[PDB]
């Protein structure tokens, strides 16, 4: 009876069927996390995790911040941790890693597939509009031709978005994509959406057509706020914006590629540098916005912070909810919205720490959910999530829509439309 680092105790069904309840237990998925969201990746007939487990991608452990990222997501020395992957092996090289920083009460469960994914009785869980947030392997069976699951359509086209940045897309991008600049669905002078005509036009253009199954995908490039446009750094999060634009036009199948461009890279798979010429259509097949709701102007947020069902979600970071910036260097005004709920969204105007993981995929989403019941950010309101001028508001309503919430929106003009008419309050410093 000795702790021992490179062999761990194995746990029942039955003993781990008693205890789903405890709140002294940690489950562990150490699947990828598009397996966690309900991706049926080796083929199981259901998807997800265990109920109540917590996601921790065996693929995080060449993270250097590894024991940093375990400890924000709570997961203590003193909670008995059990793993959990498509087989007991892949949970090896974790238990160990639990147990070099301190932790020992380790266990590794052997049979969640096919025993526990294979019996109805046997508790699961999954995001419920998971397959709008596509692993890599999805893409790359798209391209190449392969069955994949949740696809039904014959018609397809891979976006690379960006700022004004086409240096993004030409330095490496997936086969056969083609690149929007972020300018082409939204205007530079409101940063809002453009007019139904413009998306007409530039939707064909771009040869998208409603029935389109449209997959966005960006590249980080670390965005520097020393740099004229930091946003052309941060491709990821146009293509989310962009894949609201879509959406809310009316292209009725948009997927967003889990984690973007890393994502692809990192599955090894091949990357091109052509310039793919657009093949353009010449109709788009739809009025345009078909899904008007999804997007909330200035007149309706308005009435949103008087309604006692509505709220607006202010999606900025912390120096610019007390006006110590603006986050923008073409924006002047500094100061907040009154009666937003703050939903902090990480360090600056062009990262999403608290909404993403270290490889940029989605934040586990229940963590996400319970951050924003603590604020009562909750599914029975009407939810329009803003920031700046969209960007960041666009990827926190994603990830609620992601989670099937029946009424959310993105306040498209933001703090830039509400402080350029100085007849809107605004409140300044700390709470
Ligand atoms: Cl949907
Ligand atoms: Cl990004
Ligand atoms: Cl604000
Ligand atoms: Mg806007």
Same mark, same amino acid.
């Given at each position: 009876?000795?702790?021992?680092?490179?062999?761990?105790?194995?746990?029942?069904?039955?003993?781990?069927?008693?205890?789903?309840?405890?709140?002294?237990?940690?489950?562990?998925?150490?699947?990828?996390?598009?397996?966690?969201?309900?991706?049926?990746?080796?083929?199981?007939?259901?998807?997800?995790?265990?109920?109540?487990?917590?996601?921790?991608?065996?693929?995080?452990? +060449?993270?250097? =911040?590894?024991?940093?990222?375990?400890?924000?997501?709570? *997961?203590?020395?003193?909670?008995?941790? #059990? @793993? %959990? &992957?498509?087989?007991?092996?892949?949970?090896?090289?974790?238990?160990?890693?639990?147990?070099?920083?301190?932790?020992?009460?380790?266990?590794?469960?052997?049979?969640?597939?096919?025993?526990?994914?294979?019996?109805?009785?046997?508790?699961?869980?999954?995001?419920?509009?998971?397959?709008?947030?596509?692993?890599?392997?999805?893409?790359?069976?798209?391209?190449?031709?392969?069955?994949?699951?949740?696809?039904?359509?014959?018609?397809?086209?891979?976006?690379?978005?960006?700022?004004?940045?086409?240096?993004?897309?030409?330095?490496?991008?997936?086969?056969?994509?083609?690149?929007?600049?972020?300018?082409?669905?939204?205007?530079?002078?409101?940063?809002?959406?453009? +007019?139904?005509? =413009?998306?007409?036009?530039?939707?064909?253009?771009?040869? *998208?057509?409603?029935?389109?199954?449209? #997959? @966005? %995908? &960006?590249?980080?490039?670390?965005?520097?706020?020393?740099?004229?446009?930091?946003?052309?750094?941060?491709?990821?999060?146009?293509?989310?914006?962009?894949?609201?634009?879509?959406?809310?036009?009316?292209?009725?199948?948009?997927?967003?590629?889990?984690?973007?461009?890393?994502?692809?890279?990192?599955?090894?798979?091949?990357?091109?540098?052509?310039?793919?010429?657009?093949?353009?259509?010449?109709?788009?097949?739809?009025?345009?916005?078909?899904?008007?709701?999804?997007?909330?102007?200035?007149?309706?947020?308005?009435?949103?912070?008087?309604?006692?069902?509505?709220?607006?979600?202010?999606?900025?970071?912390?120096?610019?909810?007390?006006?110590?910036?603006?986050?923008?260097?073409?924006?002047?005004?500094?100061?907040?919205?009154?009666?937003? *709920?703050?939903?902090?969204?990480?360090?600056?105007? %062009?990262?999403?720490?608290?909404?993403?993981?270290?490889?940029?995929?989605?934040?586990?989403?229940?963590?996400?959910?319970?951050?924003?019941?603590?604020?009562?950010?909750?599914?029975?309101?009407?939810?329009?999530?803003?920031?700046?001028?969209?960007?960041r508001g666009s990827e926190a309503w994603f990830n609620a829509l992601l989670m099937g919430w029946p009424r959310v929106s993105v306040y498209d003009g933001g703090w830039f439309e509400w402080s350029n008419d100085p007849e809107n309050p605004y409140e300044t410093g700390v709470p």
């Amino acid at each position: 009876k000795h702790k021992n680092m490179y062999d761990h105790t194995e746990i029942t069904t039955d003993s781990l069927l008693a205890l789903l309840g405890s709140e002294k237990v940690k489950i562990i998925d150490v699947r990828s996390a598009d397996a966690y969201n309900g991706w049926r990746m080796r083929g199981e007939v259901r998807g997800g995790h265990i109920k109540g487990a917590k996601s921790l991608p065996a693929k995080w452990l +060449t993270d250097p =911040e590894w024991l940093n990222i375990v400890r924000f997501k709570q *997961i203590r020395p003193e909670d008995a941790i #059990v @793993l %959990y &992957g498509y087989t007991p092996e892949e949970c090896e090289q974790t238990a160990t890693r639990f147990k070099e920083n301190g932790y020992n009460n380790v266990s590794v469960f052997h049979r969640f597939h096919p025993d526990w994914t294979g019996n109805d009785a046997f508790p699961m869980d999954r995001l419920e509009q998971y397959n709008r947030l596509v692993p890599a392997e999805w893409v790359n069976g798209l391209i190449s031709g392969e069955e994949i699951p949740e696809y039904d359509n014959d018609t397809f086209i891979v976006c690379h978005a960006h700022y004004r940045n086409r240096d993004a897309y030409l330095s490496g991008h997936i086969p056969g994509a083609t690149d929007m600049d972020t300018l082409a669905l939204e205007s530079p002078e409101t940063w809002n959406r453009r +007019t139904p005509e =413009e998306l007409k036009k530039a939707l064909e253009e771009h040869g *998208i057509t409603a029935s389109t199954t449209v #997959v @966005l %995908y &960006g590249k980080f490039m670390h965005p520097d706020n020393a740099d004229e446009f930091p946003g052309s750094a941060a491709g990821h999060i146009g293509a989310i914006r962009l894949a609201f634009i879509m959406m809310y036009a009316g292209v009725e199948d948009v997927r967003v590629l889990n984690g973007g461009y890393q994502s692809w890279t990192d599955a090894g798979f091949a990357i091109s540098k052509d310039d793919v010429p657009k093949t353009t259509v010449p109709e788009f097949g739809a009025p345009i916005p078909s899904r008007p709701e999804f997007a909330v102007d200035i007149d309706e947020a308005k009435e949103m912070l008087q309604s006692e069902d509505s709220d607006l979600v202010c999606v900025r970071s912390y120096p610019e909810y007390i006006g110590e910036v603006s986050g923008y260097n073409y924006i002047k005004k500094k100061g907040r919205i009154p009666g937003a *709920i703050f939903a902090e969204c990480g360090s600056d105007a %062009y990262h999403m720490e608290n909404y993403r993981n270290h490889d940029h995929t989605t934040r586990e989403y229940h963590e996400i959910e319970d951050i924003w019941a603590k604020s009562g950010i909750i599914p029975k309101k009407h939810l329009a999530f803003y920031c700046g001028t969209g960007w960041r508001g666009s990827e926190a309503w994603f990830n609620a829509l992601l989670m099937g919430w029946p009424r959310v929106s993105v306040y498209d003009g933001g703090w830039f439309e509400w402080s350029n008419d100085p007849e809107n309050p605004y409140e300044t410093g700390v709470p």
